[PDB]
Design a protein that fits this description.
Layout: E1 3-4, H1 5-12, H2 16-26, E2 36-37, H3 39-64, E3 74-79, H4 85-96, E4 111-116, E5 119-124, E6 139-145, H5 152-163, E7 167-173, H6 182-191, E8 205-207, H7 216-230, E9 241-250, E10 254-263, E11 266-267, E12 271-274, E13 277-285, E14 294-295, E15 300-306, E16 315-319, H8 322-345
Parallel strand pairs: 3-5, 3-6, 6-7, 7-8
Antiparallel strand pairs: 1-2, 4-5, 9-10, 9-16, 10-15, 11-14, 12-13, 12-16, 13-15
This protein binds guanosine-5'-diphosphate.
Length: about 350
């Protein structure tokens, strides 16, 4: 003090003409950048530069938080009995560790992930063969055998999947067999109004062999492709929301539930309600057997601590406290009771 303008500028990491512009907006009059500033003013300048810069760092932050991270595609497999669903799932579950040493673990949490350079894909395991619930799968892979073709069962699977909001992918399996005619199946698909992309339609058709592994990598790349196109994303910071895949019992363990996380992040100690089932999460284990402290979108984990058994397809919801988990769970019990005895009246 009293500081010259070119001095203050160097101080603030600023440009002479930057600071001069600022003084004019500020109302402080100078002669040239050589001029001296009253410490009153310089103190104001130092302050304003904090305001403006802090706000810009703030606006940049809110800017990036508008952009939500992606999430892996969740895939279900459908089809007609004998057409190779099971064989395909096993293969996919084989193809993940071509690394032996395990370890480490492979328990079954209801879904598994296949990591590719192009991305990670999540596969529902849990065969129930359907049974409504809450949306689980983004994509359905409809499996068809090339020696058999399209059965009414396949027509059902296709109808179901669309009704469930799934984007369809048609997999033509068993192409190793000499009696296999994939073109026949394509014709059947077109006959039914699904036109493959090679003929200019929007249907996706990948010939594969679950036995040999032919075209399975291509099937994977196509799933990830349609994922980018659909652009699946989720907010890890939202109110945690997920869905129950399967919930079973274990003698020493008790009630366990497999859960897919959809939005948010569940952590240990969170109180959750699923349908009429509530509880506190004691522990969480993934497909790798790792005990997890936190779970974000795309994660299939096994949850310990439910008081009842949650039904599959039921939504898992975060709640602040045990009491809130209890009231919500209880109210859903009331309505179900009442609406049950309402079915006593009308048969
Ligand atoms: N040749 C051949 N057989 C297959 C292929 N995929 C599955 N299979 C056979 O199809 C039979 C029944 O299929 P499966 O795995 O049980 O699937 P799912 O019946 O639809 O649940 C099994 O004996 C498999 O070995 C394939 O790509 N090629």
């Amino acid at each position: 003090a009293k500081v010259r303008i070119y001095q203050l500028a160097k101080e603030l990491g600023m440009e002479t003409q930057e600071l001069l512009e600022l003084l004019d907006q500020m109302g402080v009059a100078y002669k040239s950048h050589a001029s001296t500033l009253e410490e009153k003013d310089a103190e104001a300048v130092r302050e304003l530069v904090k305001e403006q810069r802090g706000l810009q760092e703030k606006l940049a932050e809110e800017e990036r938080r508008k952009s939500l991270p992606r999430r892996p595609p969740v895939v279900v497999i459908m089809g007609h009995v004998d057409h190779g669903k099971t064989t395909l799932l096993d293969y996919l579950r084989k193809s993940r560790i071509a690394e032996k040493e395990a370890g480490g673990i492979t328990q079954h949490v209801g879904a598994f992930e296949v990591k590719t350079p192009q991305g990670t894909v999540v596969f529902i395991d849990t065969p129930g063969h359907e049974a409504r619930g809450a949306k689980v799968a983004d994509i359905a892979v409809i499996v068809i055998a090339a020696d058999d073709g399209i059965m009414p069962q396949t027509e059902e699977a296709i109808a179901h999947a669309k009704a469930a909001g799934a984007k369809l992918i048609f997999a033509i399996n068993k192409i190793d067999l000499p009696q296999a005619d994939p073109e026949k199946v394509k014709r059947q698909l077109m006959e039914r109004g699904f036109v493959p992309e090679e003929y200019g339609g929007d249907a996706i058709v990948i010939p594969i062999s679950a036995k040999t592994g032919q075209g399975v990598q291509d099937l994977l790349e196509m799933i990830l492709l349609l994922a980018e196109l659909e652009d699946y994303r989720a907010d890890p910071n939202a109110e945690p929301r997920g869905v129950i895949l399967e919930s079973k019992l274990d003698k020493q363990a008790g009630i366990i539930a497999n859960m897919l996380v959809q939005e948010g992040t569940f952590r240990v100690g969170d109180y959750v309600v699923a349908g009429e089932a509530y509880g506190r999460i004691r522990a969480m284990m993934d497909a790798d057997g790792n005990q997890r402290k936190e779970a974000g979108p795309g994660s299939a984990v096994q949850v310990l601590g439910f008081q009842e058994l949650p039904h599959a397809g039921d939504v898992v919801e975060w709640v602040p406290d045990l009491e809130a988990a209890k009231e919500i769970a209880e109210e859903r019990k009331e309505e179900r009771k009442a609406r049950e005895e309402e079915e006593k009246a009308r048969r």
